Amino acid sequence: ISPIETVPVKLKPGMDGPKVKQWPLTEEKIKALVEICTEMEKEGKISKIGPENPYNTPVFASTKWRKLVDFRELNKRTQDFWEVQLGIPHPAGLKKKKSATVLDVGDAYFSVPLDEDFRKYTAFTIPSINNETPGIRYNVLPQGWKGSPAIFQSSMTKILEPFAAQNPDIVICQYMDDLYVGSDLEIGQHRTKIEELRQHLLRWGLTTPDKKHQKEPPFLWMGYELHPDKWTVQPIVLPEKDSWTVNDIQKLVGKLNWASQIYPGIKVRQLSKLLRGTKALTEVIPLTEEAELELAENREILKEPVHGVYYDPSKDLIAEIQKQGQGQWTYQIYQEPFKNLKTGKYARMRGAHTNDVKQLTEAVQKITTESIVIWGKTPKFKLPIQKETWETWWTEYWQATWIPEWEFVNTPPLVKLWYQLEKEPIVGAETFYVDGAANRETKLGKAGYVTNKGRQKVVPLTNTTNQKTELQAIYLALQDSGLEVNIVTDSQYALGIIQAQPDKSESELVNQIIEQLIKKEKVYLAWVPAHKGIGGNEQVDKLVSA
Amino acid sequence: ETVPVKLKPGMDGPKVKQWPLTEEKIKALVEICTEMEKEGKISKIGPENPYNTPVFAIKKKDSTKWRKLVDFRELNKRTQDFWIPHPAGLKKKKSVTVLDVGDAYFSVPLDEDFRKYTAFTIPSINNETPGIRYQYNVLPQGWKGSPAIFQSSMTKILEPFKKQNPDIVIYQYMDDLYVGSDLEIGQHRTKIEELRQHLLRWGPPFLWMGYELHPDKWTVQPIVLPEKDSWTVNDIQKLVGKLNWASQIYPGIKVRQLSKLLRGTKALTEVIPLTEEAELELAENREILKEPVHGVYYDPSKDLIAEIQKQGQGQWTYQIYQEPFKNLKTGKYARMRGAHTNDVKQLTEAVQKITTESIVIWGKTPKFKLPIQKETWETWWTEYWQATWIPEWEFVNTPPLVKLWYQ
Ligand SMILES: N#Cc1ccc2c(Oc3ccc(F)cc3OCCn3ccc(=O)[nH]c3=O)cc(F)cc2c1
Ligand SMILES: [Mg+2]
């Protein structure tokens, strides 16, 4: 049946129809608008309406130009619909077949009819030259309408549903305006089934030209290029201009990002750091040498051509991660050794205090999430961390944390715990009661410590907040102490930052505390309530007060 | 026919994106949904319906059969409130068995206008094909209105058995049913089977299974003070800190004498004898903790809140409260599942148990404070869930440090 059932569309609740007066344009423009417009009515795309309809929408526009209509006002009045996922299938998930044909659909939007009662809101009055003619007042899915994509896709779905069931041997992936079909039957049968499907489309008014031979492989998808047994991104290009602008950074980062899918080792952190302000695409920012080196390294890997294999459910799914350093991580997902399904990169989520273990865990979830999306199953992980390192970490962590089934891979740099804090006080280690204060009105402040041996110290500080002195009081105790030391503090802030077990921080003082912690053999950090008169905590708090 | 239902005024239909599903779960949903469509319980929907409710598959404990599950938590909050009394005997009953009665909910149709709010989408892998869109034509499992609309029918069904066994306590939670008696387990199971046949006769893929509880064995974990003979400075420090923390719950706690022992700057490892007066202060504090906190009683209007702490060695602590420091219940689980391999599973098992204990006692689920990062919980929490309901939760990314108090 040529008729295709139309989806009911209703204007937004309590919303009126769109009425926008057409802007006066040149006569040559209206001389062509009424030209194509008459053809569309001959084709049945549009129908002239009586003067009763009040709604209106503006109409603007090689050898000739094309028509257009801005239904944004109409779109605002139009109701919300289920939206097709913007995600595009990644080739790494695409399974291998003997033949693969791509059937494009011609004028899918125009081919799809529209809800009868909604057609009143698509009126677009036609302009008249010099107002010398009465204004000329859609029957199908209009181009540019909010509900057009979903309606056309949803319409196609119901259309294709019967053919799929009748021919389960063929697999038909659905994407906007395109229809990708593959099968493992003989080449003659595949071409045969392709024609059967095209006829089923015509029976509902759908043109998928095979007369013009469908583009044979290779196929260049909008995302990347594809082949019968391999997939790769479109070739990259390197300007190598002596001076780069702001818009140069985004273009290079964007193009490099797309390359990280198949080409391992891509790094964009240094480049992104250069465009910190990114004030104006026209603004020009000088290149840094660290970023320049990143491009030089990126250029090396980019030179060699790379390809990825398609997925085989029989083969296992493996993901391998390595630490690039400075918060950068590269991973590879492969079913067969040396042959990668896909490659990617992860960057540290914004934070003030971090360590290697957590960042690795974060990468797993990022890989795990992408894997379930592209294949529907978690991969086995080859991780650069000793099983004992992980057991110590996750068991001692205060939060719940877990990593899927994984194996150790000896490829450096390995993930390790740079320092571990004792759970019980170190007997025979000098005890350091610490406290630090700072005036709110005057940034000036002080920080010091007291010990059981009588040792003491107080240091005046300037341009310091109360918390900084609390951490500053700990730095001193670490420097002026031996390899084994107990530290008693009242600062929950300092404790909450050390019980987070960081190995690199955005605060230089934290790093210097980390550096002493790495140096020391054993360190036990205890906490006591402030102003509770607990031991030397009151003695050390008084010395640093104001 | 049907009962009218509308959303709370000013609240639109729930629209929640369908989180990506494993291929195994995607297949299971297609088979369940494909048969239900044949049964007419669900029907396809076009793009006109912009609402969406998440759906995923689960397998009950010791169950090889996939059960469809829909996250109606957003729809439930948007659904207009109704207008069941919660029996206290369940907690005292020696045994309480749970039965999945959600199948009966499918017999009753639902209003057409509200059916648009039950839209759920079966996802597709690698965005290869547009996901399948379904809508409930009957009372959907996991909905708030489903147990209420069917409630009257459930009573008429359970009327004869209730009269036959008045001592037995029956309580119904959405998609579930709890039956409690003090009889022996053998007779209890027999009565349960009799009740199963009762529903079968008036009518269940999961009706045969039975979950056994013993609320009589349930007990609350109290806050205790270690009794030692050699008290070190660090012991007194930690001991004093805990007591000062517990003062918020119990004002009577005093820490003066213990602080006196701390006077002076001494090493943590040095042992400090406890003065007789300090030992008395510890004794008086030890007594105050053996007694219940005053003015602590459940308020039906206030929602329950639950917090979990990862103590370690496969041990977890939880406290259920309606006010910041007014604790209604406190306990600790141990060896739940994957005790020494996977916390996410232990936390998922803990969230379930706590909810069960909450339902048996107050007929409603608490809001959970999950000691876990959001991305960690959202990635795997679906793989270990074995219940028909889903409570509320938020994540606490700040180190409490108070776990030692809840030891
Ligand atoms: N431009 C373009 C284009 C062409 C075919 C596509 C495709 O076609 C396929 C359709 C169904 C299917 F099962 C498997 C497909 O491709 C599997 C991968 N592949 C492809 C080509 C080939 O020669 N060999 C091979 O293995 C599936 C798909 F998402 C996107 C496609 C985009
Ligand atoms: Mg102080």
DSSP codes of every residue in B381-397? GGGS---S---EEEE--
CA angle B282, B288, B292 (to 5 degrees): 155
**Judging by DSSP bridges, how do beta strands A484-489 and A430-438 pair with one another?**
parallel
Distances (CA, A) of A214 to A111, A182, A233: 21, 13, 22
Q: How many CB atoms lie within 10 A of CB A519?
A: 12
Of all protein residues, whose CA lies closest to atom 31 belonging to ligand 1? Answer: A180
A496 and B310 within 8 Å at the Cβ level: the answer is no
Q: How many CB atoms lie within 10 A of CB B90?
A: 20
Q: What secondary structure does DSSP assign to A19-50, as a single string?
A: B-PPPP--HHHHHHHHHHHHHHHHTTS-----
For residues A250 and A241, what is the distance between their CA atoms, to the nearest angstrom? 15
For residues A182 and A173, what is the distance between their CA atoms, to the nearest angstrom? 9
| Contact in structure between B55 and B142 (CB atoms under 8 Å) | no
A334 CA from centroid of ligand 2 (Å): 56
Interface test with B, best of A5, A6, A10, A82 (most B CBs within 10 A): A82
For residues A484 and A424, what is the distance between their CA atoms, to the nearest angstrom? 12
Strand order in the sheet with B42-44: B42-44, B132-136, B120-122
Q: How many CB atoms lie within 10 A of CB B214?
A: 12
For residues A128 and A59, what is the distance between their CA atoms, to the nearest angstrom? 12
Distances (CA, A) of A340 to A93, A160, A334: 12, 34, 4
φ, ψ of residue A165 in degrees (nearest 5): -65, -40
CA-CA-CA-CA dihedral for B8, B11, B12, B15, to nearest 10: -100
A98 lines ligand 1 (CB under 6 A): no
Find the helix packing angle between A187-202 and A148-166, rounded to 10°: 130
A482 Cβ neighbours under 8 A, 6+ residues apart:
A429, A430
φ, ψ of residue B382 in degrees (nearest 5): -70, -25
For residues B394 and A484, what is the distance between their CA atoms, to the nearest angstrom? 40
CATH T-level fold of A27-83+113-148:
HIV Type 1 Reverse Transcriptase; Chain A, domain 1 (3.10.10)
CA-CA-CA-CA dihedral for A73, A74, A79, A83, to nearest 10: -90
Phi-psi category of residue B238: left, alpha or beta, with phi > 0 → left and psi -120 to 50 → alpha: alpha
- B4 contact A CB<8A: no
A226 lines ligand 1 (CB under 6 A): yes
| Residue indicated by tokens 């905590």 | A537
For residues B150 and B161, what is the distance between their CA atoms, to the nearest angstrom? 18
Q: After which residues is chain A broken (C to N over 2.5 A)?
A: 61, 137
Nearest residue on chain A to B375, judged by CA atoms? A365
Nearest residue on chain B to A450, judged by CA atoms? B265
B208-213 contacts: CB < 8 A, separation 24 or more? B209/B60, B209/B62, B209/B63, B209/B99, B209/B100, B210/B97, B210/B98, B210/B99, B211/B61, B211/B97, B211/B98, B211/B99, B212/B95, B212/B96, B212/B97, B212/B185, B213/B95, B213/B96, B213/B97, B213/B98, B213/B356, B213/B360
Look at the alpha carbons of B5, B7, B12, B16 in this order and tell me if their dihedral is positive or negative.
Answer: negative
- B276 contact A CB<8A: no
| Residue indicated by tokens 């031996």 | A482
Question: Whose atoms come closest to the Cα of A540: which ligand?
Answer: 2
Q: For residue B406, which of B336, B321, B308, B263 has the smallest C-alpha distance? A: B308
Find the helix packing angle between A289-303 and A246-259, rounded to 10°: 40
The per-residue b/e assignment along A189-228, b for 16 or more CB within 10 angstroms, e otherwise, is ebeebbeebbebbeebbbebeeeeebeeeebebeebbbee
A318-408 and A430-544: identical CATH topology: no
What type of residue is A197?
L
Binding-site residue positions of A for Mg(2+): 104, 177-178, 435, 470, 490, 541
B363 CB burial (10 A radius; 0-12, 13-18, 19+):
middle
Question: Which chain A residues contact residue B369 at CB under 8 A?
Answer: none
| Residue indicated by tokens 């571990």 | A420
- B230 contact A CB<8A: no
CA angle A69, A71, A76 (to 5 degrees): 170
A166 CB burial (10 A radius; 0-12, 13-18, 19+):
exposed
CATH number corresponding to A430-544: 3.30.420.10
- Mutation probe of ligand 1 site: the residue of A226, A307, A375 with most atoms within 8 A of C-beta: A226
A166 CA from centroid of ligand 1 (Å): 21
For residues A156 and A177, what is the distance between their CA atoms, to the nearest angstrom? 10
Phi-psi category of residue A440: left, alpha or beta, with phi > 0 → left and psi -120 to 50 → alpha: alpha
Q: What secondary structure does DSSP assign to A470-529, as a single string?
A: HHHHHHHHHHTS-SEEEEEE--HHHHHHHTT--SEESSHHHHHHHHHHHH-SEEEEEE--
φ, ψ of residue A311 in degrees (nearest 5): -80, 140
Q: For residue B115, which of B134, B141, B136, B139 has the smallest C-alpha distance? A: B136
Q: Which atom of ligand 1 is nearest to the CA of A219?
A: 1
Q: Does an H or E element contain B152, and which? A: helix B145-164
Length of chain B: 407
In DSSP terms, A163 is beta-bridged to none
Q: Does an H or E element contain A383, and which? A: strand A380-383
Question: Which chain B residues contact residue A372 at CB under 8 A?
Answer: 20-22
Spans of all domains in chain A: 27-83+113-148, 91-110+149-217, 231-303, 318-408, 430-544
A219 lines ligand 1 (CB under 6 A): yes
A2 CA from centroid of ligand 1 (Å): 29
Domains of chain B and CATH, by start? 4-88+114-154 (3.10.10.10), 89-113+155-212 (3.30.70.270), 213-298 (3.30.70.270), 299-406 (3.30.70.270)
CATH number corresponding to A91-110+149-217: 3.30.70.270
PDB experimental method: X-ray
A70 Cβ neighbours under 8 A, 6+ residues apart:
A20, A57, A58, A60, A144
**Judging by DSSP bridges, how do beta strands A522-527 and A99-102 pair with one another?**
unpaired
B312 and A396 within 8 Å at the Cβ level: the answer is yes
The per-residue b/e assignment along A2-37, b for 16 or more CB within 10 angstroms, e otherwise, is eebebbebebeeeeebbebebeeeeeebbebbbeeb
Residue A133 CB-half CA count within 13 A? 13
The B residues from 317 to 346 touching A (CB cutoff 8 Å) are: 340, 342-346
B49, B263, B379 ranked by CB distance to A82: nearest: B49
CATH number corresponding to A231-303: 3.30.70.270
| Contact in structure between A208 and A215 (CB atoms under 8 Å) | no
For residues B53 and B73, what is the distance between their CA atoms, to the nearest angstrom? 9
A228 Cβ neighbours under 8 A, 6+ residues apart:
A100, A217, A218
Q: Where are the alpha helices (DSSP H) in A106-208?
A: 108-111, 148-166, 187-202
A35 CA from centroid of ligand 1 (Å): 40
Q: What secondary structure does DSSP assign to B91-104, as a single string?
A: HHSSEEEEEE-TTG
A484 CA from centroid of ligand 2 (Å): 25
A82, A427, A526 ranked by CB distance to B133: nearest: A82
Distances (CA, A) of A258 to A309, A360, A375, B361: 17, 22, 20, 55
Q: For residue B22, which of B136, B122, B160 has the smallest C-alpha distance? A: B122
B81 CB burial (10 A radius; 0-12, 13-18, 19+):
exposed
B49, B133, B399 ranked by CB distance to A496: nearest: B399
For residues B387 and B378, what is the distance between their CA atoms, to the nearest angstrom? 16
Q: What secondary structure does DSSP assign to B333-378, as a single string?
A: EES-SSTTT-HHHHHHHHHHHHHHHHHHHHSSPPEEEESB-HHHHH
For residues A474 and B239, what is the distance between their CA atoms, to the nearest angstrom? 23
Q: Does an H or E element contain A220, and which? A: strand A219-220
A100 CA from centroid of ligand 1 (Å): 6
A88, A424, A535 ranked by CB distance to B127: nearest: A88
Q: For residue A153, which of A130, A124, A174, A122 has the smallest C-alpha distance? A: A174
φ, ψ of residue B393 in degrees (nearest 5): -160, 155
A478 lines ligand 1 (CB under 6 A): no
In DSSP terms, A351 is beta-bridged to none
A7 and B400 within 8 Å at the Cβ level: the answer is no
Q: How many CB atoms lie within 10 A of CB A405?
A: 8
Pick the CATH number of A318-408 from 3.30.70.270, 3.10.580.10, 1.10.357.10, 3.40.50.2300: 3.30.70.270
